[PDB]
Every structure is written in C-alpha cells, then in structure tokens.
Amino acid sequence: VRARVISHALKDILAEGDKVIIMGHKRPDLDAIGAAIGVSRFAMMNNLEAYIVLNETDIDPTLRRVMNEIDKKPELRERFITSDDAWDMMTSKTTVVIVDTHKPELVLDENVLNKANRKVVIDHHRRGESFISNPLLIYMEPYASSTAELVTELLEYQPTEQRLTRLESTVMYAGIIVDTRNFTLRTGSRTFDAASYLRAHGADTILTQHFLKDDVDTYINRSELIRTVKVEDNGIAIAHGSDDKIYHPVTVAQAADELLSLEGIEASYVVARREDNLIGISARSLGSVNVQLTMEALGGGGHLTNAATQLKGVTVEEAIAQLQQAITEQLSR
C-alpha cells in the first residue's frame, strides 16, 4: 500500500516538471547506478524525458565494466550525461531525483543539486544532520537493503508497455547483490521480492558475476595472509603477513572479514606491515567476542564486531606478542 501511494505520487511529480535529472552519490557504486537506471525507466514508462548525471572521473573499475555493457545499447547509454550538460539543460521546472543518499555534500554534483528547484529523495539509510532541502517527495526506508530494492517496488505500479529491460534489471540486481553481499546482510522478504521482480525481467546471474569478479593478485595476497591463521579453542584466530612485506590495508581488512566465514572462528586478528614503521591489525568478530576492547587496549578502536589499530615502531612478531597480551588480559577480564 505504501509503495503504491509513493509510486503514483512520484509519477505525478515527474510528469509535472519539464524533465528528470537523476543523481546518486559521489563515487557511485552499483546500487546508486542501478537505482538511477531504475528511476529513468520509471520515467520512460510514462514517456517522460530523464537523464542520469555521471562524469568520467566518477567511473571506478567496477562501474567501468558496467559501462562497457551499457555502451552496447545507445538508448540506455544516451540517458547518461555530464554535470555540465545537466546544469545547462536544467530549468526551474526540472525535477532532480537524488538516489541512495540524502546529504547534500555526498551528492554527486552539489551545483546541480543547488540549481535544482524541484527535488526528490529515495534512500535507505537512517537520516542524519544534513538533508536535501525542501524535497517534494521523500522515500526513505532505513530497513530496506538498498535504493535499488526501493525503486523496484515503485516500478511495479507503473505501466508495463515499456518494460524494464534485461540489462537495466541486471544492473539493479547487481546493486542489491553488492549492498547485501549476496543476501547475507540487510536482507528481508522485500529484498527477495525485488530480486524476484528483477529476475522476472531478465536479471542475469552470470553478467552480475562478471561485474563483481575479484582480481587475481588480490586473491593471492589475501590468501597469503589467511593461510597463516592459528585458531585457539576459544575461537580466537590470528593471521599475519611477514615482517618484510607491506600489504594493502583493504587486503588486510578483507582477510579478517573472510576468516569469520571459516569454521570455529569467533574473532579474527590479522597483523600485517602497513609501512616501514607501522604495523596494522584488523579485528573482526561474529558478535560475541569484543574486538573493540582489544584494539583500544593497543591504541586503536572501532566497534564491537569491527575494529583495528596501527602500531608504530614494532615488528610483526612484536605486534603479535603485544596483541596476544591484550587478548589474555581481556579474557581473564
């Protein structure tokens, strides 16, 4: 009932203006792009004129493989425009739709946002300090998985003659896959309803897998860290890189995350040289062992399931020894 009311109100607004400018957040990910694609399909179903703001500097490596697919169909590709062309074509009757964010400084192009007289916000985060000013409509659902899921619900109440295409729903499906880490996070029944809808319109598993393929170098670095793991009977796992190899901090973080997927690990600590005078530790927990307190003890911090520290002037082995001492202190309380 709620999405039906929101869907028709949004169609009223979009047809009420002179054209639709759709904008995600800075450095868009596949949920922002998929949501925007979904909103531009919302508009074409009602024969409206809609564009998505996207600059060349905005296209990261994951977005670039998606664009390589989008390039193969000029109708979809023609809907993408730059900040400048969006600015030049905007009037006081233009509706800007902000997808997958609600804070003016995270918007992909603040100047397009500032020129906008008519604004719409669709987002799935919890509202904070800053907010898009004077929105005509707000679709915010902090429990939903993604903005793609939200925009999918809106599509269902719109005319079906100009259906969502196979590539369009593949990108939207990819956004849900990324935001939920393939249905393991923030995933409810309505997430699966949206996936059902997208799948019924041709959303492609194999093309989604293509967008999200892992690099081979980084799989081999990550696994170099993982293979060293030692697990105590209490479920504490420790893994390390050698004292003379510098690991990327994202690789360390991913190793600590991936250890939680192995049997019998309640909490993971990955220790790897970050600079020549700096050792990094990434700590992750299933939710019972408190890795926040362990990292705080060593001069870092974070949250109970997700924390880290950096240690100046020690070797990897010294940082392991200092980490084990923090763990002992904390379990004897």
Ligand X SMILES: Nc1ncnc2c1ncn2[C@@H]1O[C@@H]2COP(=O)(O)O[C@H]3[C@@H](O)[C@H](n4cnc5c(N)ncnc54)O[C@@H]3COP(=O)(O)O[C@H]2[C@H]1O
C-alpha 24/C-alpha 112 separation (Å) is 12
**310 has binding-site annotation:** yes
**31 has binding-site annotation:** yes
**Within 10 Å of residue 181's Cβ, how many Cβ atoms?**
11
Q: Which does 309 bind (CB under 5 to 8 A by kind): ligand X, Mn ion, a second copy, none?
A: ligand X
Q: What residue type is 196 in one-letter code?
A: S
Burial class of residue 192, CB neighbours in 10 A (0-12, 13-18, 19+): middle
Specify the residue, 167 or 226, whose C-beta has the smaller distance to a second copy: 226
CB of 29 to Mn ion, least distance (A): 4
**Within 10 Å of residue 93's Cβ, how many Cβ atoms?**
11
Among 250, 262, 286, 321, binds ligand X (CB under 6 A): 250
Q: Which pair of tokens denotes residue 134?
A: 């004077």
**Within 10 Å of residue 94's Cβ, how many Cβ atoms?**
21
Q: Which does 229 bind (CB under 5 to 8 A by kind): Mn ion, ligand X, a second copy, none?
A: a second copy
Who contacts 209 (Cβ-Cβ below 8 Å, separation ≥6)?
A: none
- Choose the stretch contacting ligand X; rule: CB under 6 A; options: 4-12, 98-106, 200-208, 246-254: 246-254
Specify the residue, 159 or 287, whose C-beta has the smaller distance to ligand X: 287
- Choose the stretch contacting Mn ion; rule: CB under 5 A; options: 32-40, 211-219, 238-246, 247-255: 32-40
**254 has binding-site annotation:** yes
**Within 10 Å of residue 171's Cβ, how many Cβ atoms?**
28
Collapse the DSSP code of 128 into the 3-class scheme (helix H, G, I; strand E, B; otherwise coil) and give the result: coil
Of the candidates 123, 118, 115, the residue with the CA atom closest to the CA atom of residue 24 = 123
Of the candidates 238, 218, 232, the residue with the CA atom closest to the CA atom of residue 317 = 238
Q: Which residues bind a second copy (CB under 8 A)?
A: 182-185, 187-193, 195-197, 199-200, 205-206, 209-210, 213-216, 219-220, 223-224, 226-227, 229, 231, 260-265, 286-287
Crossing angle, helix 30-45 and helix 166-179, to 10 degrees?
140
CB of 279 to a second copy, least distance (A): 23
CB of 225 to ligand X, least distance (A): 13
**114 has binding-site annotation:** no
Give the residue ranges of the annotated binding site for 3',3'-c-di-AMP: 254, 282, 284, 310
Binding residues for Mn(2+), by number, are 25, 29, 31, 100, 124, 179
Q: Per the annotation, where are the binding residues for 3',3'-c-di-GMP?
A: 249, 257, 282, 284, 306, 310
Q: Which residues bind ligand X (CB under 6 A)?
A: 249-250, 253-254, 282, 300-302, 306-310
